[PDB]
Design a protein around this ligand. Sequence first.
Ligand SMILES: *[C@@H]1O[C@H](CO)[C@@H](O[C@@H]2O[C@H](CO)[C@@H](O[C@@H]3O[C@H](CO[C@H]4O[C@H](CO)[C@@H](O)[C@H](O[C@H]5O[C@H](CO)[C@@H](O)[C@H](O)[C@@H]5O[C@H]5O[C@H](CO)[C@@H](O)[C@H](O)[C@@H]5O)[C@@H]4O)[C@@H](O)[C@H](O)[C@@H]3O)[C@H](O)[C@H]2NC(C)=O)[C@H](O)[C@H]1NC(C)=O
Ligand SMILES: CC/C=C\C/C=C\C/C=C\C/C=C/C/C=C/C/C=C\CCC(=O)OC[C@@H](O)COP(=O)(O)O
Ligand SMILES: *[C@@H]1O[C@H](CO)[C@@H](O[C@@H]2O[C@H](CO)[C@@H](O)[C@H](O)[C@H]2NC(C)=O)[C@H](O)[C@H]1NC(C)=O
Ligand SMILES: *[C@@H]1O[C@H](CO)[C@@H](O[C@@H]2O[C@H](CO)[C@@H](O)[C@H](O)[C@H]2NC(C)=O)[C@H](O)[C@H]1NC(C)=O
Ligand SMILES: [Ca+2]
Ligand SMILES: [K+]
Ligand code: NA
Ligand SMILES: [Zn+2]
Ligand SMILES: [Zn+2]
Length: 779
Amino acid sequence: WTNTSGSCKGRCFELQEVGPPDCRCDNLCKSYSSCCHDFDELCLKTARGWECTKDRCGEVRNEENACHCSEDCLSRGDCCTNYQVVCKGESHWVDDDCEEIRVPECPAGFVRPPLIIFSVDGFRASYMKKGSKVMPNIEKLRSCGTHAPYMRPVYPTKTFPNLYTLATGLYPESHGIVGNSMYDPVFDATFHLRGREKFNHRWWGGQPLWITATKQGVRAGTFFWSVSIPHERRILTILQWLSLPDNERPSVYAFYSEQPDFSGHKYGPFGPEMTNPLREIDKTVGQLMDGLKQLKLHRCVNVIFVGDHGMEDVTCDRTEFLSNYLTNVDDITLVPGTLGRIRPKIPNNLKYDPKAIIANLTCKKPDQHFKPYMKQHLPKRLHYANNRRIEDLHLLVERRWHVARKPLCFFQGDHGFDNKVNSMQTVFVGYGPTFKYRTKVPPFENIELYNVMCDLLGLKPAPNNGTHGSLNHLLRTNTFRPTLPEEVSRPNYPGIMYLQSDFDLGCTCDTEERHLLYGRPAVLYRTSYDILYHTDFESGYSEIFLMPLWTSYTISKQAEVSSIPEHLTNCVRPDVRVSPGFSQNCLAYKNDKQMSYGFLFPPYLSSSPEAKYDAFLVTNMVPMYPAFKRVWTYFQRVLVKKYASERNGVNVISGPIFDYNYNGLRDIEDEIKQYVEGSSIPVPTHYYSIITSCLDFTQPADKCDGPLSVSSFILPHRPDNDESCNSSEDESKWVEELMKMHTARVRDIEHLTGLDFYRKTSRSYSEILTLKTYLHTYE
Ligand SMILES: *[C@@H]1O[C@H](CO)[C@@H](O[C@@H]2O[C@H](CO)[C@@H](O[C@@H]3O[C@H](CO[C@H]4O[C@H](CO)[C@@H](O)[C@H](O[C@H]5O[C@H](CO)[C@@H](O)[C@H](O)[C@@H]5O[C@H]5O[C@H](CO)[C@@H](O)[C@H](O)[C@@H]5O)[C@@H]4O)[C@@H](O)[C@H](O)[C@@H]3O)[C@H](O)[C@H]2NC(C)=O)[C@H](O)[C@H]1NC(C)=O
Ligand SMILES: CC/C=C\C/C=C\C/C=C\C/C=C/C/C=C/C/C=C\CCC(=O)OC[C@@H](O)COP(=O)(O)O
Ligand SMILES: *[C@@H]1O[C@H](CO)[C@@H](O[C@@H]2O[C@H](CO)[C@@H](O)[C@H](O)[C@H]2NC(C)=O)[C@H](O)[C@H]1NC(C)=O
Ligand SMILES: *[C@@H]1O[C@H](CO)[C@@H](O[C@@H]2O[C@H](CO)[C@@H](O)[C@H](O)[C@H]2NC(C)=O)[C@H](O)[C@H]1NC(C)=O
Ligand SMILES: [Ca+2]
Ligand SMILES: [K+]
Ligand code: NA
Ligand SMILES: [Zn+2]
Ligand SMILES: [Zn+2]
């Protein structure tokens, strides 16, 4: 029971923690029906609106007014934000020239620059192009501070997963808010964006910034605002908190606006009706900045202007219905719209038939505007599988479309799609003493921001998925000095210890400086492996997994592609430096009716026939389904050379990935669940390739003076090409399309392999971290 007879007098929006029996006077009080009886009366005044007018200057204070224009308002901290402009002849902040802020200029008693996070819902990155004609305050923040052209949200590109990712630095699969709506089979309970279940703490994992701050003795303002509280009151409240005594004042603040998302849904992102909401948000930013100027804080505070996701054109006329594909959709529950998650209507309904459902949803219409995936087959870059709240069956929906269960307008916009889709990208601007001045930075992922906010606050971040230091380039100071991980396993460099006669493998056959331009990868786990040198490639061959952890080679732009001769079609040779016992055997391949093999270094790119025979080495071989071979051969034979030509040479590192439990992390031996028939040769779930060149394409890759350029992939190792609806055609019609979908960051590959790349370069470690987080999106 909470005793609501208490009073909020002297208590409005108090930061003090207040539990029942006591009644409350904060933002959460309504959700808990715990407000004091006079909360709305005392704490939510609205009289006279939010702006001083000339006729109010030097009024006697009426405590019934929403804000004040009396002479004493400044000392008390409750002036309307435009008081000085109207009453004292000052200028709005937006009308002042931009001046670099080289160090914080903070009033007496401020020990560090406060951080204010200004989040806007559904703010598409491209809205920024509207510029000062529509958003003069925001344009000033953007042009004078540090901005990215866009910031990449997490999937699904909806509000709750993204706001909580901003707060935690975690992927949804890790923080647990995997959708605006979700079912947890262990709780047997359902979470919705609207309603009370979401208030239960059991849903929310990781450690959000406000808790990190609090635990480390840094005080936070609210990070939740009741929907009933107007934006003007949110801003006034923040400004009032900033006026508090040194011993009460928070260091970090959050503002949230539900616009322009609401209007985007109603009118679509390109609607003329979007101008007004955008003007309104700008006016709010203006109130904040004017208010800060009144407090002499406008050159003291760090401000982050950040969105949760973008907005796409989606109308009623573009809806796929599952009832067109499946016979009884009333027996399933679909989380619908811009994504699909399917489970039986009755939890654990035993007659649920997922393989039959997937088969009926696979490439059944030529223009089909979604694609079904078991979650472990989703592109690894989405990091969307390792959580019990994520249904096994997922539908990745085409941009501009919806998926609905059945047929049984008012909306022209929506979001939720694949987070590399352009329309889903959102905004980032940082302005203030700790950010750079008039600086543009490359796009980056929202998972990175938690570390930076911790930096801006002097906090040590909880473990998260950001790569700390990858955003140091946004900052004038307070950068984090990263340190290189220590290698855990040093390699063996084995010479010949055997003879061809030594092997009974079933086969028949009738540098470091040049091929590892950025140094050899460090192995960050305990294992046993051999460095193997060759004319055309180097590898780290694992004695445990019976194949390379990595194969590294450089291909000049002028490099010549050769065919493989018909007599060498099935040539596999023993490797005299590696024991027969630590080798794969071709008998297993001849014997497995479903699994073939491929090579990490492609024979096609041999320097010479003598060298080409090295490519057929048993230690360059890896297990590949014929379906995958269609992809890999096209990549090895055609694409690698094409990249070399377009990029002026490339350095390639390729290898296997084992992630049977789909947690995005290197499997231990125990976790591997498939082997070549009759053998102990483990089967990769994916194959990766990291392709690097000189950012300045005029320089060849091996002669690169400056920054690097990288693209990487994590290709799923599957027994069929059902994912590619056009795979019956020549590889030139579908393989690249598949590869683009499975683009990846180097950092993703690092998690999955336990390797550390780019350890020997002429660039800073921070620059390299940025490179490792880069994602080539093909948008
Ligand atoms: C992104 O970054 C995160 C954060 O570093 C990484 O996630 C971590 O992975 C490691 C290694 O697998 C896990 O270590 C294990 O920890 C558990 C004990 O963990 C419990 O206590 C910790 C610490 O307080 C807590 O964080 C954990 O929270 C998990 O479980 C909660 C209760 O169910 C849940 O509410 C919360 O959301 C989180 O669930 C997620 O992780 C679990 C696995 O723990 C997973 O089953 C679930 O689906 C979610 O993904 C938990 O109470 C020990 O038993 C082990 O010995 C081992 O030490 C961390 O627990 C895990 N941390 C978090 C917060 O997820 C990711 O790997 C990284 N991803 C990538 C791709 O790099
Ligand atoms: C709810 C997220 C929980 C915690 C994360 C909090 C903060 C994250 C970091 C920085 C900025 C601060 C944000 C604080 C947010 C406060 C208000 C929180 C939720 C309001 C939710 C809301 O109003 O959603 C509106 C819906 O139209 C979204 O529906 P969709 O359009 O379908 O996604
Ligand atoms: C709920 O709150 C009211 C307000 O504080 C409490 O009312 C006071 O209670 C004591 C009774 O011993 C009186 O002396 C005061 O006159 C009351 N104050 C007012 C302004 O009403 C009430 O006690 C609380 N209910 C509880 C504790 O169950
Ligand atoms: C998958 O689609 C096929 C239709 O292509 C469905 O087959 C129908 O099933 C009903 C009863 O099961 C038969 O009486 C109809 O004759 C079939 N339709 C056609 C056009 O042949 C099948 O039911 C679907 N499977 C699922 C799981 O929805
Ligand atoms: Ca794994
Ligand atoms: K075979
Ligand atoms: Na196919
Ligand atoms: Zn949103
Ligand atoms: Zn929305």
